[PDB]
Amino acid sequence: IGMFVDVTSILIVVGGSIFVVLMKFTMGQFFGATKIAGKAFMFKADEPEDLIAKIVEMADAAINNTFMQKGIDLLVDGHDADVVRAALKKDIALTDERHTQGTGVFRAFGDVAPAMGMIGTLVGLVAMLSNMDDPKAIGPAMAVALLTTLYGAILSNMVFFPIADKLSLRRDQETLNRRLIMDGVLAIQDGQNPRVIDSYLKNYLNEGKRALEI
Amino acid sequence: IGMFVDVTSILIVVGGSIFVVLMKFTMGQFFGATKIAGKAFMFKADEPEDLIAKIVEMADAAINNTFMQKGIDLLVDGHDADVVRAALKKDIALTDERHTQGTGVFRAFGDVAPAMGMIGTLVGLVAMLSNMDDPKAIGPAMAVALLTTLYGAILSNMVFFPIADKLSLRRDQETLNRRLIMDGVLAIQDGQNPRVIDSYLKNYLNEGKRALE
Amino acid sequence: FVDVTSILIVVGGSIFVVLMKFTMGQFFGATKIAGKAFMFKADEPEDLIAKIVEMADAAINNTFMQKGIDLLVDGHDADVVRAALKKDIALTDERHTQGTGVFRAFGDVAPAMGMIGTLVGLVAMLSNMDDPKAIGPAMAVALLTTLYGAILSNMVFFPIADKLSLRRDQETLNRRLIMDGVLAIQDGQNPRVIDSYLKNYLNEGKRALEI
Amino acid sequence: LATLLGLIGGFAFVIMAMVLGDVTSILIVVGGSIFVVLMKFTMGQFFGATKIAGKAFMFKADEPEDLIAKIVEMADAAINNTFMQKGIDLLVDGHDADVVRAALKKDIALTDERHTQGTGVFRAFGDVAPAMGMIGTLVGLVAMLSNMDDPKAIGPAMAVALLTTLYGAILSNMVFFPIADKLSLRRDQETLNRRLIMDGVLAIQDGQNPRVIDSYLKNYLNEGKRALEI
Amino acid sequence: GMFVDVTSILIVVGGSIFVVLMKFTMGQFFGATKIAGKAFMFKADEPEDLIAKIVEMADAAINNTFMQKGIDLLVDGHDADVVRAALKKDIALTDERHTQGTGVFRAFGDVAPAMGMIGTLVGLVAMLSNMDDPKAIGPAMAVALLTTLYGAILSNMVFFPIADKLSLRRDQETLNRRLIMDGVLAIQDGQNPRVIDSYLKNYLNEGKRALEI
Amino acid sequence: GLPLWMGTFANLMSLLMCFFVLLLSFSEMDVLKFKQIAGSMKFAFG
Amino acid sequence: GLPLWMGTFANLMSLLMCFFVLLLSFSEMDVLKFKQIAGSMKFAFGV
């Protein structure tokens, strides 16, 4: 309600954070980071088991994910093992780098929001004290300063840092799926049976964060 | 209102911590960490002295511990030293990873709890300062601020951080025990003297924090 | 609010502590490199890549490119020119890191001087208490010190350090790219293969977002 | 000026001690700190750490100059110090150089680890004391706010609750952390002394020249914090 | 007025002294103070002056302790290992001395704000408990404010800048010692003056001095 | 660790708390208003 | 960086501060008490 909303406080916090962030990230970089965050929040990463099932279902014959779309299209084009390896590792590194940079953008935002809140609360306290003949009606004058501090804390702890953490988790999942799809495409190019590759495909599915799931 | 304030403070602190942690870790990760913490707090690590006595007994002969069961099963299958060592090292690394990730989950809880406490405190303080003319309003707001700060402090310092420390201690004990089993199984496979391996294993009794003599 | 005395206090204290950390000449060098990174633009990698391609086809505004071309023209070998270019790159990296350090030190020392100034002002007002109506506004001007420090620690010094680090990374990328271009030119490679190798650098540690 | 600094440090400790003493406020801090710390160190480990701290504070270390004097006296020949006594007994009984080196390095590592564990115990106490003080203060604040009867008692009761926080600070910066720092200093001193004794014992065993080993031992004395003393 | 000022000074300075004396021995503190005094009342030698003196000596074949030590060692010790080892030992000794002085002063500046916070809390408790005697809250407020102010000033304007200046002096001294060691090695090897001048040119622009050029 | 803005926030908050205690030292509190506030706080805390 | 408990210290300080502002909300200034406080503060700071 109207006690928790202040135009000047949100303006100070948002403008200061945007200024400081644009001192290290261009507008295109920030927009790409927001696009990556929206993709990671509104879309679900493909299940590795479903990916393995799709790989083994399409292996014996010789389509939803774009990575395996590109893989099968380029294999149809008929390139070499060095070509497929180079292109797929390049795509993996590219995706990892943009995810890391989006994490950096949102972490810079989360680090700079509470400093802007401190600046805003200092401005509010100065404004309160400059008009204090008697300490009677200074409650609402302090409310705006604590409001700027609260805005900084909320944006830092409940918005920007969770977005960065979700981007990190999405980067991990995307890297795992990319490695799985690369291995499947290499196996299909070689022409092995579907059963032999599945023996080692899921050996390292318990890597890192998933180690607690067993 | 008396119970409503407590409910609101608990909701703020706990719900915020859970929401923030579930972005860092998947729900399965949180459940696994909870299970590992419960196992560390309800079950006792096996004493290295009993482990040494049992393993020198087996060396003389040439088993409730699961790692010993796996090592003995690998050894009786006639596998090479390298393969068995690699498998047991993989098991040790897996246990290390699980314990480290559980400690990380509880550390994330511990450093997110005071932030939620601060958010709730500032909310309560703003609400109390804004409603200066309403005596019925500042009571619940001041209570919410105080209780949310107290809950953040208590959950961070007396629940989540000590649970992480307990998990680290359990990880250290499990690593020591599994390394002891590694060395003893290697010695049994090689067939060294039981007294020499007993002395070398007793040498492990003064490692880390066990310096209480 | 606006107060010349408070900004003077913060700036003077920070300057004193930094001059105890660095020297005055190093401070002036840091200011010069910060200015060069602010009012000038780093050369875009695409233009440099096109320039390497054009010189390869035919066989210069960048000073590093001019130095490399001159070191090639007087019949030199790969290792000596490589060592010279590595030395120049390391010198630029060191200068940028030192400037970043100077502005980081300013940023960490500004708020402490702000707190010292406001505490001194509060002590003065407490020792000179005359009129109750003036106990409130007095601390206002005192707090003006802290605010200033905060602002200078977050809108000026730390952003300048971040901009210096950004320009350091951009210059390192450009000079490494010019290194590979000059090595290719002295190696006599095809323009197309070196062109592809050079565009391989266009998805570096910060330009992947715009892709 | 050394006496003046010692006196002012003692006076600061004394005034902090009388500010500390009140019983309940420190009791809550220490109870919470002990409860939190016992999930990292067992009761026996805590008692061992307290014994190490007491032995480091009361009993003074041997001056390395006297150690070098004794070592060179024994070398020219052919003891209250326990490590030196063990080394002398081991070399008199007759053993290889490798066995002596292994045993002496084992003892050195044991003392190093014991002192590191004690330092960790007291540093954990130092980290956890202020948070427990603040928790006690917030509990007291809740009790006060739920028991308002007289405005004149708002001030003093507040000063009581905040008191707990004070104790935490005084317990963190003036007892536990200084004890950990003194334990680290004692660890460094005992490690240096034991390394000197090991080198001297090896030199005596190998029949080295007294002059070169004396030069080596002076070189050992001329490093570490002792570099400020020259 | 004297009592509250001396109480604040006693709290801050005496507490810092007690804690640091727990950290460092008194002799080490006095050595650190002498090192800081030398670094504040004696300008470092210009490395260009050292290079000019070195080339003058090389062409030919005082006022510097290291140079006197080097020439005394060269006129008697004909080998290279002894001279090089002695020079490296002196360099390491000076580095250790300056590092320990930096450590002493950084410890002082670290402990000062903790004592300031303790003093603020003590003054707050006293002023809250009294709250009715005007003669009792003036001194308490004075003690709180002055402990905070003294801690801040001593930490950020005395001890930390002294440690930073000691680091600067260590870097300058180490650069000069390397230059003198290289000059001695060149004059022992009979190198041409021009090549060693070109080789010390890159020594000149090492690290901080890169900003001047 | 924690960001330094939190330390500046704590230092400023404690400083201004000292100032407000000073302000209350020479101020007289209303009795009826204090009783209302006390009753409300007691009801809210249970 | 800073000690982990500095956040709770800031929260406690803000709590006490806002409680004191609440108390000041219904407080009335006293001239004579202010004069006594000012004299004591002048004496304490050595003026």
Ligand code: NA
């Ligand atoms: Na203060």
Ligand code: NA
């Ligand atoms: Na004040």
